[PDB]
Design a protein around this nucleic acid. Sequence first.
RNA 1: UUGGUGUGUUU
Lengths: 45, 169, 66, 57, 1161, 51, 51
Amino acid sequence: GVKYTCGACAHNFSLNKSDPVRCKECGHRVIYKARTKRMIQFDAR
Amino acid sequence: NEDYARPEWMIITVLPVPPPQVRPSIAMDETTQGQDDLTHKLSDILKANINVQKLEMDGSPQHIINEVEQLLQFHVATYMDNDIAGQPQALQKSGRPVKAIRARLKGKEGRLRGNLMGKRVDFSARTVISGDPNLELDQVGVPISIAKTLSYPETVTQYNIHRLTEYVR
Amino acid sequence: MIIPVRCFSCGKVVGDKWDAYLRLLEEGKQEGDALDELKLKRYCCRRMVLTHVDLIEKFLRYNPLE
Amino acid sequence: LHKMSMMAHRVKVMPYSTFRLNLSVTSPYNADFDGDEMNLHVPQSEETRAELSQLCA
Amino acid sequence: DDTITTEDCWTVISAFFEEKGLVSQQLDSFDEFMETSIQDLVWEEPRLILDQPAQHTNEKDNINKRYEIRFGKIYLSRPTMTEADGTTHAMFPQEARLRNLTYSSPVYLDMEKSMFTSIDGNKVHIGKVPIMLRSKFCSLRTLDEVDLYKMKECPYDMGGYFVINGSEKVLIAQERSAANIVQVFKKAAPSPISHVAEIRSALEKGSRLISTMQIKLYGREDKGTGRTIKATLPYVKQDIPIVIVFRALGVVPDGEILQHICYDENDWQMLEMLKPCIEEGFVIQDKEVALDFIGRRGSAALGIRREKRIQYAKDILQKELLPHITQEEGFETRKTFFLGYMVNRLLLCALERKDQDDRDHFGKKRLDLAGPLLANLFRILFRKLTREIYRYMQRCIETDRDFNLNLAVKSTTITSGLKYSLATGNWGEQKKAMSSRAGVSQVLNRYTYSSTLSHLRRTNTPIGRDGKLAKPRQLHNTHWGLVCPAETPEGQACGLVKNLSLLSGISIGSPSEPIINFLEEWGMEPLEDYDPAQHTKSTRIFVNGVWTGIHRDPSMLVSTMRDLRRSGAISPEVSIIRDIREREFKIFTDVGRVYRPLFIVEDDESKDNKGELRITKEHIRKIQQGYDDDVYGWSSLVTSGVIEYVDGEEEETIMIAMTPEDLQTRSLNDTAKRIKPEMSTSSHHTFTHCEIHPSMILGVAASIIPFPDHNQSPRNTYQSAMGKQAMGVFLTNYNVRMDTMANILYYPQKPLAKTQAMEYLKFRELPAGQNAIVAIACYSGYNQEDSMIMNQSSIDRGLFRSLFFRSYMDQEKRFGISIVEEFEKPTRATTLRLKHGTYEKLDEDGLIAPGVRVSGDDIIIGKTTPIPPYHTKRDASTPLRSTENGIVDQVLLTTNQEGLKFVKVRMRTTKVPQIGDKFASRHGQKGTIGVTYRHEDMPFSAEGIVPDLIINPHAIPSRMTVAHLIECLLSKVGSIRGYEGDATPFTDLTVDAVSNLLRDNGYQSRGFEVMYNGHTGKKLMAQVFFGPTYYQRLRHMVDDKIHARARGPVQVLTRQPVEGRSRDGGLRFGEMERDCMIAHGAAGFLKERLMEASDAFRVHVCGICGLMSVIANLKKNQFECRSCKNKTNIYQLHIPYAAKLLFQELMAMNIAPRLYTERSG
Amino acid sequence: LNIRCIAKKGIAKEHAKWSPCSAIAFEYDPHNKLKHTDFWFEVDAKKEWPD
Amino acid sequence: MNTSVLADEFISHRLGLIPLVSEDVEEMKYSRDCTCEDYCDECSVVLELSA
RNA sequence: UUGGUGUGUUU
Ligand SMILES: [Mg+2]
Ligand SMILES: [Zn+2]
Ligand SMILES: [Zn+2]
Ligand SMILES: [Zn+2]
Ligand SMILES: [Zn+2]
């Protein structure tokens, strides 16, 4: 469900806790999560 | 002295076993227990013990006796001391020496200088300091969090109920 | 990195005067004289632009992260 | 290093988390302010409180 | 031409530091390793031989089945990550660092297995040698900075260091004693042995220790009547007389030993000390009886008869003594004439025709970098490979199988060895853990950029710490331009740790054989035509430790060879070095000599260049074109004859002036400038060398400092050992890198007191601090002793506000073939021992989504293992630290080396520089932020300028750091005239020019402006000195060292509270605290401390046998001293649990402490 | 880059991002006729401190 | 939404340094005594930006 | 909530 951002081709792909974790375009195996649905806050000082 | 130090007691027939608080098992990675080296050494002693009692119950070529007995003496020697001159040390399963009882007592970080004469304790605190001349001579500044962490037991008496109830509040 | 907004010492807003400062530098000015033209007369708003060294170009040298 | 190197004091509570001193006590502890650490043991009884307050003050 | 000015030397430095960059010393010698060393370590001992020859219960089948493997060529490539999938692809250092990898290449090797039939198994991956960054044999030497941003490598990175199990490790240049030099030390007095002539042998190829022949003069000062000497040999057990080992090496009569040794039949004093040595060695008269004699002490075996006893003695005198000279025979003249030089020398020093030699005369040492270290450890595990193949061969020849060799290399051997031995650096086979030079390789530090720039250069010294001796810790005066007279840490390291200077280069290791050809190329005469009575005045010539011949005139030869290094017939880093005093002349080619460059002064009265510098301005214009007028870099300078290299041995034989205005003898009494000496001793000098620049004597963390030449030198050392703790910009790719420490300083300014040297550490393009406003004036007692004042509004504007990064880690373990781990969100039911934080911030997949505010004490990585055979899972979460806050950045998720999952998380927050945070001058005037004032409450000068940092007047006058004032003044001027003033030291920049310019731009001459109270404006009676200055931020804060503790974690072993900050331990109320408690005497406080806030523990004693054997059941409330049948004489005590531990330990050693509770007498 | 800010009303006491103004000169008695200030001086007080 | 080369509180800091017009400001009240729980259009100037 | 080694830094 999570947009696991690809490390190479920027593809937003979710994985079902079962997929071997790579780029679908070049085999690049590095993903990262993307930012939340929440809104971040800061006090700007 | 007879009732205290009778010099047939300086030869050990029966070498005691301490309880396992003195060699308690350590969680290697939270499922397996690496043992303390006293447990490894008392196991080695009991193995050489049984390999002693194996020889006098069968055919014994007379220096097989001598070597297993001298090995028993060796294991009892390294139980109390792994620093004996002239001979190589008793060695572990990493390439390290064994923690004896003598190594638990001598040295800067033994039990006395490292744990009894001086030790670590609690209700301490520690920081970095700063000057502040707007003060008396017998006053020291306290950061608030350190005041929160440490405490002091004041007795509930008949002259301090109200404030202490407030300090609950 | 990239230009701050105010001065550190006084508090005159300077951040706008970065691009103008580079454009004045392009013609062959000298840096003190360029600060002279921008009306920077206390040295507070002279060290807040004179010292400043630029890294965020190097961060945009990373051909796209995503 | 000498018998003043532990001395009793009184408590003043301040924000901004560092230890405050007088600067006349800088000489006996031999502390400067390039980052020294000074400890703070606490009594846990009445008895030791009076011990400190009458001798090690 | 004209005057070579200062900036012409900065042209020279731009050419040098555009050729090499910085870290030549790693890269070029590691290239030497990968190009030649493994090829020759393999082809050292290329063949093994088995044989199972005859009487195999045979039919007399006498068959030399000789099993012969010959090792061949190595195969080299890029690193390769074979997946758990099995696919192989090009690994890259980003993909390395993200994935805990080992940037390691295939090292292949073919095997020539042959069989003797004299009757009477392909490219195996043999190991993974890890590849350094930025090497020739890394894939990032080449390839296009554009694509390097496409490949995540910063151009202002430089590499030099290795990658192991992910993280970055480095090689300290370890510092060994020099080999094969003929030393003399004198021995301490409570002993019968006074003078010593010592050596340490090591083979020419290979650079490996074999022998250590020692000489001990028997005789204290008028003690030890027979003043004769014995030798000590390798593989003996006892000292052996000198003339006997001479007759053992094959020179028997007295006349030829005195002909070999003695050079003066008139030196009757030394000849007089000679005579008893022969008169003592009379009883062993010819060769083989001395061979038999040394057979009796030195491991020739008992009952092994004369011919094989003497065989063995001929082996310790064939191999195993003087091995580095040669290991073939026939040159007993070479061996004995070496030893005759030794006897010559030790008798020179025992009559004190000389000083003793000294330990630290820095030409008499060498250095070991990655090249020689990989040579040694590769040699070791390569021998281990040898015997592994040998072991498998003697099993698959008994059963006689055609072995394919590919199941005969379990290549976890050398990969596992090198991986551990750079992992912790406990240098050796792990089963040689102790007795090993510990701490070779180190965590590389990435706290700021210059810190790494020094730390990649650092050398360390193995005296150990046994011996408090201040002779090896002296700044001994060979150090001119080779190490750093400023930088060395505070404390235990001091005097040892030597940072290679900003003109250091590491000499590689070179074929000595053509140098030999250069020697015999001019009629050097051989050693066998040598008679010192025929030639007493010939010059005896060394090549790295072998005397090879004699010659009459060294001067024409050193002209020719020195000009051939000025041309390039030699390696231009080989130190051809002349002496004239000894009638000797050495050529080192050795590995690890610390050399340095100098401007070649035309030292020769042949033309008008004499006295002048040979460097012309035409060369300067050539360097400013980038090419020669039909590539021209620093290499062509080296091979032009303008700059020659010297190491510490040629530093003996030179003559330097410091700056090129001192070469011509100059033209007064001005009270601004500095006073060079006259040098009027030699009316007609022959200067041979002049310094390029004096601020090139510094280390890397030393050239940063503005004007080091106006301070008290402990503050120079302090500033150099604080410059490494700056907060700044460490490498420009902190977006993609995941490291456990990283900190970005926000607003980094190049200092207005820049140097000219900070161009070459890039610090003006990556700085690590700011210019804030200095105002040295006691204001309200808050800067009394080194604290300071900081204006809070300036922080609110962003002053030094600090980014904070941290990378965590976790991975999956495998507890069975069908039993693995799983990072999931654990329940409150199925899982054991939930952490006492919450779990809410976790996601469906166990790793928290970014953007989410995080506190301490709550999870990020919940590693749940089901317990191998409800309530069957283990909660083994990896939490965020108990001190931190933050908002999360870039949550990596991938697959490990193992094939399972892998995680790394890079949390971040930002720390406000607040009260207590340490700061630092650039002259050590350090301290903490004492107090914060808002904006109006500052003092403020006539225009409105307020300050931000107020160091103390009383911080100055004893610390004597007048350079700090000079920096503040030069800062204010270069701010107002608007440019960065050259504060590189040792110029004619006085104070007078700065004074006149500040006045003539409309100000006071000596800095002051009339500043005010902020609370009245009633003018401050004295005028206040006031300006900008460059500041930095040291790595400590107060939020990392505050700690207090009520109770909590106690150890199982001793029940005394635990040690360390990380587990919230307790403090050590140590010995001398108890001492001062005794001095005050209030011991009731001491009974609080060592009973009640610690391991308070309660035991029992039977009152008859006095022991603690009494078994304690309490809810049944019964007791039994079972050695006594005592059931009534029972007391309890209150003792420390460690005291009880003492008692149980002692009774387990059979001593009986018995505690009777009454005085007896 | 999609950002949403609020703007609220603070003074310089909370923080100096609410600084109204920049830099304030201030002087009185430029010829020291009260001798409230005292010059430090090498040689002579009148020459070296510019007007 | 942010995806920049700059971190977040960084940009909030730099936005805090930005000069606004406040000529009319005394008929705008202080934040900590304005009659709303968290922000409304009585006491805010909501900037939403997405370049 | 591990041990045990080892390295660097603070006074
Ligand atoms: Mg100090
Ligand atoms: Zn992709
Ligand atoms: Zn300004
Ligand atoms: Zn009893
Ligand atoms: Zn409202």
